[PDB]
Amino acid sequence: NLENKTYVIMGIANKRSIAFGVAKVLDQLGAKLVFTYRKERSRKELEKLLEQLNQPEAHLYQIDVQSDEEVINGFEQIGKDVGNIDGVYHSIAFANSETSREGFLLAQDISSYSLTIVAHEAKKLMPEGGSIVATTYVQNYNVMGVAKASLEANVKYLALDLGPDNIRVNAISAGPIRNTILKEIEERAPLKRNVDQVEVGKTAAYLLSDLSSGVTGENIHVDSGFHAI
Amino acid sequence: NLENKTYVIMGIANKRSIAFGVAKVLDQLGAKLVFTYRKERSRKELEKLLEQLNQPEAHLYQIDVQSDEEVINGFEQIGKDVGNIDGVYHSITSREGFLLAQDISSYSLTIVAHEAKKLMPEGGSIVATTNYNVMGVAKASLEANVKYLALDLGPDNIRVNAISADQVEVGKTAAYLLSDLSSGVTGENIHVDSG
Amino acid sequence: NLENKTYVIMGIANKRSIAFGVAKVLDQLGAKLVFTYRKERSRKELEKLLEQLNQPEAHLYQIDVQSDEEVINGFEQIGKDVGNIDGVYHSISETSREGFLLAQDISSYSLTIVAHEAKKLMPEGGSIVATTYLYNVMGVAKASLEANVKYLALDLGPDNIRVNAISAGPIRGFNTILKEIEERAPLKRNVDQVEVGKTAAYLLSDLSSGVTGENIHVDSGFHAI
Amino acid sequence: NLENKTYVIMGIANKRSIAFGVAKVLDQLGAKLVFTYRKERSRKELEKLLEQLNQPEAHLYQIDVQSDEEVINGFEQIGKDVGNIDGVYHSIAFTSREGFLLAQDISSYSLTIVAHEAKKLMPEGGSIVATTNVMGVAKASLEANVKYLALDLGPDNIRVNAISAGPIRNTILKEIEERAPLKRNVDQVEVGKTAAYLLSDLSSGVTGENIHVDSGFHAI
């Protein structure tokens, strides 16, 4: 399916990382993978996980999307080091000033803008097109909600903007995974159970692959159809 | 990918039918396919087209979703003839107009779903592909149907999703939806329309 | 506000009909009101209700939206008896084919036809409002309605006719849900007939002059959850 | 209707401002109005326009929603100067990381903070109204914000709703008087009207809603 495809996978932290699920699946289909971590602390942990995979060699890159420079440099090195890529999976989600302006903006920066920039930089490794995918993860006033809204919109507009560049941008809206919210989901999710990294990875594969070749700007809920309730 | 999977494919009329695109893709993925046509006039066309495919043998069934009896019998024969299936692809001013539109476009799903359910003891995937446009009103009804059927059949481990509309690209998404790949997605509507 | 405006108000059945809340409000603003009932049994109840209002005289009209004929004649009599009007308020896995279609017929199509017929009493345009209350086929019917509203709003734009919907929250299983919507819905309280009538008035009135194809939730913003 | 109602009206810049249309309508209904401007340069223009209205007295307040400090202080002065208010109309208008964030800041967050501050002048509840490439993303954020605020403030009996308006002042305009159902084009007053509806008790069950005042163009 994906032999000879090269994908950048952002946001692995531990073996529980959704991003990592996504990783195991693409590995299994025979794509070559590149990874980005944020904290130096996590570099070792990634090298460990790349063992679990049949990855010919280890291509790790420290990128903090929160900063233009790192993202710019990171993609260039990947470019230099690996050549063109077929797609990017961008997993993020970080809620830490309950109503603070900094809170708000920071949320936006991480949750919505990171995509914009990644996209702008990844685009340079995708001269013939490719697929970008953003995966997505309560109190008084939910700022994280407002960030996701921003995200989803951003996906539409990037999808729209990069259309001509034959680059597809879609999102995965994830439902919960390995306890009161596990009450709620197993309770009310139509499919009557909880999703998990793999299921996501599967749709992720779908999206990054040519299989979804007519689909851009879409947001797919991998949540045992909890959305429809 | 799909070897040993059995799908019912409804709405082929000619080689241009979206449903047909969907077919080619599933055939190529090694799934065994069952077909339904409406007019007798088109049983022949379908036999023609099954020639383009690598289908061991031809399973054709005349079914007018517009009528309970045909649908009921239709699926039973499929049942008897083929045994269980893994999912179904369902491709298709005045009070009469409105209601007819609703009947064919939205309800057809409901009843198909109810009948196909009987061939999917262990779950499966159903997929529906899609001046005052009563037609719009019919699609709205449809999409809703999908959500509530998705909802109703969740517990029966049956996933209901829609594709909003070339043929091949649909087929491929179609393939995604019908396959295990889409294992957490139910009640979703996917736009294959170059966004 | 509404003196010399004339509105047709459909779907009152008892003093508790939301359609009646709507009525009280438009009465209070000085509009002349026409009424439609389905069951003969309820014509008396309506007369009794019109007593609560300062309605000069009683224009009642028996109409079953479920039938083209009644709807046609119905509007023509209103036409003849009242002349033109300014708007209309229209309040109304297993599942059989009949059920489905019936639901569609009543919940969606009814509007279409009413629209088509009221149109004839609004040569200079006006406002049509559909209210909605709340495996459920009923959902599917609402879906179909809401779309219809958009498409009618669309098709009637040029005839200067605005079509909008109100989507309403509970009043009168029930006792349990009048609790539900009181905890999680923002505002905390439950809605009521009046609230609707108010928004209804907005919509029917010139107040809502750029608004068509819109659906307004009068549910203490429950929709937002 | 609106006698003895007090509303804060933000975003007037010239006689063409939508906010100003809103203003005319509220004035005409007998509400007392307070205004905020951003640029010192625009205070005089506001005094000019307040002449067209029957405003007992001019309460003007310089507020840059871009800065917590001004917004906090402004509302207090309003508080001190006029006492409690019945609602607020928040009208605000018009690549890189900064661009992105700026847009959010002004388009979406401004509401959040204004809300949070306005809240203190509405002990018994009231109505807040926000009128409306990256700019798209900003509106999305806004529309979401309105929902969540509507949601957060429900218990305080404060209603938050938005108005989405179709353009006012010859190309992209043609497309509209062409395509849109209601057949002509939209204007200040129209907005003012719905605005009135939303700020008034008339919209008493409605919160978290977005109304399109665009001759039903949204429906297309």
Side-chain angles (χ1 to χ4, degrees), chain D residues 161-172:
Chain D
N161 308 270
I163 301 183
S164 197
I168 271 54
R169 48 215 110 298
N170 249 101
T171 171
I172 298 156

Side-chain angles (χ1 to χ4, degrees), chain D:
Chain D
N1 243 26
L2 299 178
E3 302 98 280
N4 302 319
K5 293 324 179 68
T6 316
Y7 292 121
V8 180
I9 301 189
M10 314 177 74
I12 311 185
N14 45 40
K15 46 136 143 61
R16 307 202 44 208
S17 288
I18 291 166
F20 179 51
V22 179
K24 302 203 275 196
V25 175
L26 298 198
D27 163 271
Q28 213 143 30
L29 291 157
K32 85 149 61 172
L33 302 184
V34 156
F35 300 69
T36 89
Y37 54 99
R38 198 172 55 98
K39 263 287 165 58
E40 200 59 86
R41 309 199 288 166
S42 77
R43 164 158 187 118
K44 281 149 55 63
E45 176 87 32
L46 256 140
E47 295 172 341
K48 307 273 171 171
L49 309 173
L50 308 197
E51 262 175 356
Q52 301 191 18
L53 296 19
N54 314 114
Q55 279 312 303
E57 40 196 9
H59 322 264
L60 290 307
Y61 294 81
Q62 187 207 331
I63 305 178
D64 191 7
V65 292
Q66 208 202 307
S67 113
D68 299 344
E69 178 187 80
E70 311 211 16
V71 176
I72 301 176
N73 290 333
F75 272 73
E76 209 194 347
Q77 269 310 126
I78 303 178
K80 300 182 183 269
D81 284 8
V82 166
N84 295 271
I85 58 173
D86 294 278
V88 179
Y89 172 91
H90 178 246
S91 194
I92 282 194
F94 91 123
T95 86
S96 77
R97 195 175 301 261
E98 291 75 13
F100 188 82
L101 298 171
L102 194 68
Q104 308 287 317
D105 184 23
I106 297 159
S107 295
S108 190
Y109 187 82
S110 62
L111 177 57
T112 300
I113 179 134
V114 170
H116 182 271
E117 280 308 308
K119 177 180 175 176
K120 312 177 158 172
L121 303 193
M122 299 172 172
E124 282 133 348
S127 184
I128 305 178
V129 170
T131 288
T132 208
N133 188 340
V134 48
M135 278 313 191
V137 198
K139 311 308 164 152
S141 190
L142 170 44
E143 299 177 352
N145 205 4
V146 179
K147 288 197 191 82
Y148 291 98
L149 297 163
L151 197 302
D152 190 39
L153 296 190
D156 292 320
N157 195 40
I158 307 196
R159 291 191 291 115
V160 187
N161 308 270
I163 301 183
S164 197
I168 271 54
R169 48 215 110 298
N170 249 101
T171 171
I172 298 156
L173 264 187
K174 186 181 85 168
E175 156 71 6
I176 311 319
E177 285 200 341
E178 257 189 76
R179 290 244 59 206
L182 240 171
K183 233 31 182 173
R184 49 186 150 68
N185 239 306
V186 131
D187 93 309
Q188 300 82 355
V189 164
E190 288 216 314
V191 196
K193 287 154 137 167
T194 295
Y197 167 56
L198 286 167
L199 300 173
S200 64
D201 174 308
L202 261 199
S203 43
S204 53
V206 183
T207 193
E209 197 67 46
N210 179 18
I211 293 170
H212 300 71
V213 179
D214 61 4
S215 308
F217 183 73
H218 59 280
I220 297 191

